[PDB]
């Protein structure tokens, strides 16, 4: 009744003006859906709200009933802040404004985020090693440490002009392991398991190391990154090794957890070993021990297996003791020569190993059999330097595709000309053929020419359309059919070593792979004799000789590649921009922290919450 509107009274007054209707509704409730007054008023009010097109409000009500939750856990704020690359500045501007306008602290202050960072970065969680690692500190609260690992910087000491930052490999593994705790537990439950099981778990980890390239703005600054990827986690349950986790996209840049960043050249051997060898020490030390780590309030035990496979060819040779030129031993998996592999194309066993390269290097140094340089070079099969990183004898699918394509490119050059007609080495005319080729690729395709070929160019180049388009500069009509068959066989082959699982994804291509390989080889021997006689490229060799053996051994080749976007550079750049321009040291420190957060499965859950 006038003059007091219902929404301004006391709840006594309200309940009294209303009670007339309350008895009506309470009666109604007890009849249809007794005796939940709450549910009835809910349905009513909601209808009344959507009736008047007040949807934002109705949604907020529906949300409130279900327990959410208007603000945001610091963890989610940090997730947002990273995956959108906000500076601390930017974020703070947004925080304070949303706070001010809404009165609610929907985003969290920066110190909150700072904490979420501490929880998610190496050095937070407690763990212990059994037996404790040789030459590694058992001190558990270690996060970021200096890449130089204490290297002498006296003036008369060997010049160190490089900056580097890293994690302790064990600490980093703990962090990575805790980050994906929920993934492990859910894996267990999905395999029908008490998720309390202590283990032991076997964690298969893929190592990889790459040259970032140039990371500057207008002197160039070269950078190098050692990183790992949790590829598989299995558990001992009776007699079988039950798989409780497998990285869905092993080649994504999202699970490539960064271990060490440095400002060096991957060609600069002394400093490279200076920086990486402490990591390797820790790695080895871990090879012979078990990790104890509490998860669901209950301790679990972990064993690791380190398959170092994500390496460029030049770098595999670097770290495994081989001379890195086309001379004369061309394969990092077998003892073949450029000529032997040019004549027997497809029959080669895998025979190299890190262990063997170690033995061989010792033999070359000591020369136990008193031999001449060539006799010795032959006994030791190319291994004249001491390996310092244990790698798996495999193929990086990325650098494989890149290199193969980089060969097809020079093929295209040598086929728009007539090399099987003219044996004349005129370097200038070579540059002319590259000229008209680069020209024509721009016109018929969407191909911007670039030096130092990457994987994108390689993607755009190895298609049948590019064959048709490169055919337009060729006078002969016979070679068109040869190149078409070459390309077709190559593309019949590529999916087998490019796939992360060809036993599932392309089981047809897998079985026919031997035969396709055969036809390819025959086609190289005859129709392309002019280049591939006495000579052959490393990757052609590897492709023909070693793919089926590697697949038999490991299930795939693709899954063990380097990240297929090579965005190490790109990322380093964005992360750099995300902070104040400080002393180059702190700059590095921050890029490492943010790169680490960037690859946390925990935050990624949040950022991918919108379609789960």
């Amino acid at each position: 009744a006038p003059r007091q509107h219902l929404l301004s009274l006391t709840r006594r007054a309200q309940k009294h003006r209303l009670r007339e209707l309350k008895i009506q509704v309470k009666e109604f409730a007890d009849k249809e859906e007794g005796g939940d007054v709450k549910a009835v008023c809910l349905t009513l009010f909601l209808l009344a709200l959507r009736a008047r097109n007040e949807h934002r409000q109705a949604d907020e009500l529906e949300a409130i009933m279900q327990g959410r939750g208007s603000g945001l856990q610091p963890a989610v704020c940090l997730a947002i802040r990273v995956n959108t690359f906000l500076s601390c500045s930017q974020y703070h501007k947004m925080y304070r404004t949303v706070k001010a306008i809404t009165g609610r602290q929907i985003f969290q202050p920066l110190h909150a985020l700072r904490n979420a960072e501490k929880v998610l970065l190496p050095g937070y969680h407690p763990f212990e090693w059994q037996p404790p690692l040789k030459n590694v500190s058992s001190r558990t609260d270690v996060g970021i440490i200096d890449g130089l690992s204490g290297l002498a910087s006296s003036v008369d000491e060997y010049p160190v002009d490089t900056i580097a930052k890293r994690f302790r490999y064990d600490s980093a593994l703990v962090s990575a392991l805790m980050d994906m705790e929920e993934d492990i537990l859910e894996g267990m439950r999905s395999q029908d398991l008490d998720d309390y099981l202590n283990g032991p778990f076997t964690v298969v980890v893929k190592e990889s190391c790459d040259g970032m390239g140039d990371v500057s703005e207008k002197v160039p600054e070269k950078a190098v990154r050692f990183s790992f990827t949790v590829m598989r986690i299995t558990i001992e349950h009776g007699s079988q090794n039950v798989k409780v986790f497998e990285e869905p996209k092993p080649n994504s840049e999202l699970c490539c957890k960064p271990l060490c960043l440095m400002l060096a050249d991957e060609s600069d051997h002394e400093t490279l070993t200076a920086i990486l060898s402490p990591l390797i020490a820790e790695r080895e030390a871990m090879k012979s021990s078990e990790l104890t780590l509490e998860m669901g309030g209950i301790p679990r035990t972990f064993k690791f297996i380190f398959r170092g496979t994500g390496y460029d060819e030049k770098l595999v040779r670097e770290v495994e003791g081989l001379e890195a030129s086309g001379s004369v031993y061309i394969c990092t998996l077998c003892d073949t020569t450029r000529l032997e592999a040019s004549q027997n194309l497809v029959f080669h066993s895998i025979t190299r190993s890190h262990a063997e390269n170690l033995q061989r290097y010792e033999v070359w140094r000591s020369n136990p059999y008193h031999e001449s340089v060539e006799e010795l070079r032959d006994r030791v099969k190319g291994v004249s330097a001491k390996p310092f990183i244990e790698t798996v004898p495999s193929i990086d699918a990325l650098h494989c595709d890149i290199g193969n394509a980089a060969e097809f490119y020079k093929i295209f050059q040598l086929e728009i000309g007539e090399v099987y007609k003219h044996p004349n080495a005129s370097k200038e005319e070579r540059k002319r053929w590259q000229a008209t080729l680069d020209k024509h690729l721009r016109k018929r395709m969407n191909l911007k020419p670039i030096m130092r070929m990457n994987g994108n160019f390689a993607r755009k180049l190895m298609t049948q359309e590019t064959v048709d388009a490169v055919c337009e500069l060729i006078p002969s009509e016979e070679r068109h059919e040869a190149l078409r068959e070459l390309m077709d066989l190559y593309l019949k082959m590529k999916p087998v070593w490019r796939s992360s699982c060809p036993a599932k994804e392309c089981p047809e291509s897998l079985c026919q792979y031997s035969f396709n390989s055969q036809r390819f080889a025959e086609l190289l021997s005859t129709k392309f004799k002019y280049r591939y006689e006495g000579k052959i490229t490393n990757y052609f060799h590897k492709t023909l000789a070693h793919v089926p053996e590697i697949i038999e051994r490991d299930g795939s080749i693709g899954a063990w590649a380097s990240e297929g976007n090579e965005s190490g550079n790109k990322l380093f750049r964005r992360f750099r921009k995300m902070n104040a321009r400080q002393s180059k040291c702190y700059e590095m420190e921050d890029v490492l922290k943010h790169h680490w957060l960037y690859t946390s499965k925990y935050l990624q859950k949040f950022m991918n919450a919108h379609n789960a």
Partner: protein, 333 residues
């Protein structure tokens, strides 16, 4: 008198820590950057210094020699004829406890070939180090070796991966080496308890002199001089005498006239001046000569490395606008 010298084909292989050795007129280069390539598997080179230009030609090894890795700060010396090398820093940052012996085994027209023989040791075997000093002594018939330490990595019990590359001057023991027999024995000096490195060693007859270098546990570059003596049935004694330099290189312009060219004076001050050692029989004193005509580049530099040919001339290196990593000089007296 010194002059700018240019290198050509494979300059890149030159690096701080390289060593030079002298054979009957010809100069040879050891300790390249990186492991030896196919273009020269030995890592040892003909050092062709012709008319202010350096060509680095390859060298071959004997059919029975060891193929020693490029050691980076080895203790090197001679023998009356052969060279002694021990030990150093491989290009994998490992420290060699091994002694390699450099003989020459064949001579031809333009080029020659070497013998390279590792002698292993029982002891009292010295700890794998670098920047240290090794020399030869002639007692009451006939010869022995004297090793005074430099620095090395941590003990294999106290070494942590977080401080993996942390070095420290090893014990100032004096190490006596019997080569031909193949054994070593250490001696503690009451007169010596402070470890040194990157110093300068000069010996003759049965006496060995050691000059100012650089300590670590104190960060001090002494100027003190040290004596060492030897007998024969073996024993050793020491005394002290009245410069402060680090990583100095000593040449021989004349007989018993050693020209000690620069190095470093303070942690950021390169000595830039010179000195002359008053040598004699049981009577030696540090004196000073003039100061050479350093160019503008050498003047405003922070880094000094080089080594001696033997004939008073010396080989010098300087860093370095995207043009060249190094610029080199030759210094004659």
């Amino acid at each position: 008198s010194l002059q700018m010298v240019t290198v050509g084909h494979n300059i890149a292989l030159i690096q701080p820590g390289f060593s030079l050795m002298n054979f009957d007129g010809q100069v040879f280069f050891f300790g390249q950057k990186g492991w030896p390539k196919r273009s020269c598997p030995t890592g040892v080179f003909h050092f062709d210094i012709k008319q202010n230009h350096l060509k680095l030609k390859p060298a071959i090894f004997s059919k029975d020699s060891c193929y020693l890795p490029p050691l980076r700060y080895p203790a090197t010396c001679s023998y009356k004829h052969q060279y002694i090398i021990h030990g150093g820093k491989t290009p994998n940052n490992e420290l060699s406890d091994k002694i390699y012996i450099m003989s020459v085994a064949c001579k031809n027209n333009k080029k020659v070939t070497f013998r390279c023989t590792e002698k292993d040791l029982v002891g009292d075997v010295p700890e794998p180090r670098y920047g240290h000093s090794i020399d030869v002594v002639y007692s009451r018939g006939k010869s022995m070796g004297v090793l005074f330490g430099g620095r090395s990595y941590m003990p294999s019990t106290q070494r942590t991966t977080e401080k993996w590359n942390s070095v420290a001057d090893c014990l100032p023991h004096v190490f006596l080496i019997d080569f031909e027999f193949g054994c070593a024995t250490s001696y503690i000096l009451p007169e010596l308890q402070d470890g040194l490195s990157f110093h300068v060693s000069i010996a003759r007859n049965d006496t060995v002199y050691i000059l100012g270098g650089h300590s670590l546990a104190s960060n001090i570059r002494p100027a003190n001089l040290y004596r060492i003596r030897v007998d024969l049935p073996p024993a050793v004694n020491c005394t002290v005498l009245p410069i402060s330099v680090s990583s100095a290189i000593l040449t021989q312009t004349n007989n018993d006239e050693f020209v000690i060219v620069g190095g470093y004076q303070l942690e950021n001050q390169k000595r830039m001046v010179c000195s002359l050692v008053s040598l004699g029989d049981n009577t030696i004193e540090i004196s000073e000569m003039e100061t050479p005509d350093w160019t503008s580049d050498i003047k405003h530099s922070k880094i000094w490395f080089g080594s001696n040919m033997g004939n008073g001339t010396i080989f010098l290196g300087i860093p370095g606008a995207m043009s060249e990593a190094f610029y080199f000089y030759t210094l004659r007296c």
